[PDB]
Amino acid sequence: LRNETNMVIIDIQMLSGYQADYPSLRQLENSQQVSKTEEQDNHVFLYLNAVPLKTIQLSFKVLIGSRVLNVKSASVYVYDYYETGENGFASYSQPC
């Protein structure tokens, strides 16, 4: 954290057909660090004021747009704005 960044962004990949919900979205926005939210074509951008040295946990309900399915795992990529190089990868299997 120290003297590297004071701003963070996470993007989340969707899959097949499914989405979150705007009620969940503006429920979430009334949380700490949540400077900005964005939903874009299966890519969720979350622009967060800063970074904690401790664990910060966020969750959101996901509806299902088109229930066509495939056995694929999606990913979330986090990074910073000052220098975008320092970043982090993760993924997650579908709940099906």
């Binding site: 299902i64 088109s66 229930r67 399915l69 056995v71 099906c96």
Partner: protein, 144 residues
Amino acid sequence: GSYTITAEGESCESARQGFTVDEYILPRFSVIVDPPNTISILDDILTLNVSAIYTYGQPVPGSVTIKCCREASSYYGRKGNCFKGNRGICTNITGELGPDGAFYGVVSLLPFQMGQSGFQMSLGVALTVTEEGTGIQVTHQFFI
């Protein structure tokens, strides 16, 4: 994104043939329903008739896990003012087909209240279509 041809003619009348441009891969088979959609309070059991077949026009093997339920309402009560009360109900049932390929089947309407004051006057329905290898389904939700 959205792209559109615009053309002007001799008398400056112009046609705008709009369209979307979004790369995509063609998908799934065919599913057909025809719900009655209109249900009286003096109805016993919901008969059903839902079909589906391949892209090729032949029956597909799988199951249909049908979801059908309804909450009551906001329901401010009678004690003097505002401040609504308690929660509601839903259920989970299922269906299967494929040999010839038909569930038809029914829905036990009795567990759901009848003529009480715990209603919002419509019922929500959400379908499902399984396959052995492909756990791929086709979306279908509506109200009665």
